[PDB]
Assembly symmetry: C5
Homo-oligomer: 230 residues x 5
């Protein structure tokens, strides 16, 4: 099944939204009821798996919450994404802020490196996601040297096994090359990990890694809706 | 044929639009029939060729659908684009997000390399479109050096003959040097072509290649109007 | 007369406007008349010369049409510019998208390179306008090296005598160094010229050259107002 | 006690807000009371410490005031932030401009350097806040060279002991690597510190340090509320 | 007195506003009366010196007029800037586009160089304003090499004594290092000065110098308010 985990087809999308001030109002029970119904429908249809919903309040301006859903076919995420904005009031009073799309593929050298979500691990309580673009010369570099740099890079994170990684290619799914998501039970551990990873030779082959989206996984839509601005 | 295909004048435009939340309303039957009537007119007139309409739902924020159409004269694309915005409710309740214009020309060295749309090939079910800007030294470079880089570049895509390429100059038709479009029966094949094309010396002569637009070709206007947000 | 031309004082402005969807409507005859009446008063006063009005439909998002007008003193352009927005409906229902200002000066080495509008040449049916910023090391370069670079640059355009050039300084009149406009009877002639001009050593001393505005010169106001979105 | 401060966990957020014209109005006695009462709540709950509220009028377009508050847990900053926008009129008539989050950590080589707020010092009357991002080769630089570079960096600031420094890591809490705040009783001593600090080898390892936020600490909510635009 | 001129403390701000179409209207007589009254109160108060009001119509999109005022303390500019926005109808129907703040300081090597406003010279009828940022290596450069580079810089400007300079530090007051303003009786003399300064070695140590704001000093508020779009 290790071969099946590498040959698996899974599209992953991070859908970031911002709240429109003055749109939600103070009465939100129907919005909550209609929204939880939509997600109940996704779950029983068995096609789009919602890994988490995250309260992004306080991370950045122009972003409030985010959905992380996965599916075998991208056209499934298109329809769920479209139906959310079209047939739910929460989707009609939310603006789309940023979309991070990716597709699982095996690693170039160490095929034991698999995304946390590919392996069915339990999602972390805290998350940070952001895109990634490598240097222009990265992929044509001597494969022996690139393999050496990626080994020092994996070895530099040995002290953070509580932080689960998700590196997923994103070519042609947007303006980026990879899509990154890191889950942990505590935010301060993610911060510490990013700091340590700066001490690697791979940092000399980086072109872009913004924007960042950092938030807490909520247990149910009501926990998130009731927080948003009015 | 290959000389007349190289010599023919064809302009090509990718018209990307963004839905205005709240403008479409829930009753769209008349809006669909009117839009279909507009496209049927273009066909019978036989001046502007619509290669495809694409649902971009979930690709990026601030974009929803796209029109790809072609004409021998550019002012006929101007008139169809302006008429679409002016005389159809769909175009009235849509916002222009981005325009990618190009004009067909023969390749520098290999004159058997022609866009898939120039060769009359059936359009693919999935598409990614993005503009392109080479490095400043690309064209003044030793011509035989460029020749060699483009040949290796071409060989790196030998295993993706199901992905059909459209590389069209765009000088002075916008902010870009080339308009790129790649169509295929499956989206995953485009992601993997882009990933493979990173292993080329030509990646050292790239200045810009965003924004990306990726979507699914719809069989009819109605299929698209229905997924858009109200 | 030749040194008389190099000594002239002329300011040139490209005023690009963007239509406000929903602000115009379908009864545009009076709007067209007040607009025509305004441009008649300018020519009557004989201080501001309108070289052409241009339909940019389909060129880029957030731009619809452009005015090119010239005057000996810049304050006369400010007046015509502010009166157009203040005292004509077409100006009250349009947004300023971009302004490109310049002031004619003689060339550094070749005093017989003069802008087309300074030579009084008939304006072209198709135009492309964009700003220009040279590399930081351009002007402190050896004058003889820079002189040779400009001479080879000029020679690369020998085969496009139907494309007339306006290369005008713009220092301190905005964010750029030069303002460029290229007039031709056919758009493809402008595209082919720019592609050819890439094969010059002058491309290694370039810092900026966007945004581009390309369009067709209209015979009369009505021709433009009837294309815009209602 | 320095060992206990280094090991302290403290989250810090700068919440920059911009006023909405025509939203606040002329009568504000009730907004200042509801607002003053909100901050009174945080005081009792003893979870979120407001280090200062700053009047940013005149610093930059699209920013008017700022809140600097600290919490042991970032979830507490999330709730406080979300409650302000949701449960006070001041937060409902303002929009979020920019957010600067950080987490206090011990320094690399000199463990006696601690943020001025970790030291419990008194907030300066004037402040400048801005993010920071080092060069890509900074942390993988030979540690002795970095130690020395930061030593010179420290000696170069001996002239300004009256400006208190807060340098806090910000990895994964946004688009930046560090969050910087500099507190002083006079604004001009901050300006001179930035000017003097330009003369350091550290400046050769900088990638980004904008946007800046500079303003005056207010002694109570009323005075800030009353300078804002109606 | 020159030593007092180098030791004098003076804050300078360029406050750029943007008219709101539809917000001014036609009957602007009480508007101008109220704005002239506010500026007259400023002169009587004697703390904030208005150096000029500038008509920026036609320079750039999204900018219409500019105020240049000076004060010994920056708190007094905050007060007038806020009071203008909050209490004068003009400030209420204008948007803040950009703010340029600086603080007068002595020159590094030649203390005879002083801004034109610090010496009390009559303001010029035309102006160009823009921020400036030097290269990262500029201040750590060998002082004698920077002394020589600045001396040649100054000598390049000798052909333009009619163009008066105001180069003022802007560290910590925004996103820039210097705030530049050049006043002259003719606009074409400002363009020719910029063009000539390009022939200097200091140009190899530049990072940012945009945006520009170029306009005409008006005699009285009335002269400007009548130009604005309704
Ligand atoms: C964080 C973070 C970034 C982005 C920040 C940065 O650039 O430092 C980051 C960047 C990337 C990027 C691109 C890739 C894509 C590969 C490439 O071709 O560039 C990429 C891919 C890989 N990462 Fe990665 N990462 N990464 C971790 C976290 C981060 N990683 C942690 C933790 C571990 C260690 C734990 C684990 O293996 O599960 C780890 C290891 C790997 C391995 C396997 C290592 C091995 O071969 O031994 C592969 C493959
Ligand atoms: C994808 C993709 C990109 C953008 C990504 C990248 O930059 O790597 C991409 C980039 C460019 C760019 C610019 C140009 C413009 C020419 C230049 O001066 O740069 C450009 C133009 C050409 N491409 Fe290109 N491409 N490209 C393919 C797909 C992609 N291509 C595939 C597939 C094939 C192979 C199959 C085909 O012939 O159709 C292929 C080959 C060519 C040939 C013919 C080479 C030959 O002599 O063999 C020419 C000419
Ligand atoms: C197109 C185009 C650009 C921008 C695109 C590019 O960078 O390739 C372009 C860029 C620039 C720029 C800056 C300048 C300003 C000079 C400098 O100091 O940078 C600038 C100025 C000059 N151009 Fe220029 N151009 N340019 C033509 C078209 C383009 N030109 C064509 C055509 C001809 C030849 C036809 C004619 O003169 O009628 C031509 C010749 C000149 C001459 C005369 C040289 C001579 O022959 O000795 C001068 C001076
Ligand atoms: C202002 C300013 C900047 C941003 C501008 C710049 O780039 O110059 C600035 C930049 C940074 C940055 C990143 C860091 C993060 C460390 C690193 O890995 O880069 C960073 C961190 C440190 N700074 Fe820093 N600064 N800084 C001061 C003010 C500024 N500082 C003043 C004042 C003093 C001296 C007074 C004091 O706080 O005790 C001072 C000293 C330190 C020390 C302790 C020095 C020592 O070991 O000798 C550390 C650690
Ligand atoms: C215009 C213009 C720019 C921006 C364009 C450019 O980058 O070339 C411009 C750029 C800068 C910049 C930064 C600084 C800040 C100092 C530094 O470290 O960069 C800066 C500061 C100085 N400027 Fe400057 N300028 N500048 C003039 C106009 C311009 N200047 C004119 C005119 C004169 C001629 C003096 C006169 O008024 O009598 C002149 C001379 C000086 C002197 C005096 C040097 C001396 O000792 O001889 C100092 C100090």
């Amino acid at each position: 099944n290790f071969e099946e985990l590498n040959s698996m087809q899974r599209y992953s999308q991070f859908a970031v939204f911002r709240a429109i001030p003055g749109a939600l109002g103070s009465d939100r029970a129907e919005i909550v009821a209609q929204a939880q119904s939509f997600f109940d429908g996704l779950e029983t249809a068995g096609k789009v798996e919602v890994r988490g919903i995250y309260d992004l309040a306080g991370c950045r301006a122009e972003a409030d919450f985010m959905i992380w859903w996965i599916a075998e076919e991208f056209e499934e995420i298109q329809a769920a994404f479209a139906r959310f904005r079209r047939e739910t009031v929460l989707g009609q009073v939310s603006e789309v802020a940023w979309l991070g799309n990716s597709l699982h593929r095996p690693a170039e050298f160490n095929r034991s490196h698999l995304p946390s979500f590919i392996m069915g691990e339990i999602p972390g309580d805290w998350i940070t996601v952001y895109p990634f673009v490598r240097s222009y010369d990265w992929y044509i570099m001597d494969p022996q040297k690139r393999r050496k740099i990626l080994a020092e890079h994996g070895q530099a994170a040995r002290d953070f096994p509580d932080v689960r990684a998700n590196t997923v290619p994103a070519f042609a799914l947007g303006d980026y090359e990879y899509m990154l998501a890191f889950e942990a039970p505590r935010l301060d551990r993610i911060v510490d990990l990013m700091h340590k990873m700066r001490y690697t030779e791979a940092r000399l082959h980086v072109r872009e890694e913004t924007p960042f989206f950092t938030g807490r996984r909520v247990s149910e839509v009501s926990e998130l809706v009731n927080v948003l601005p009015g």
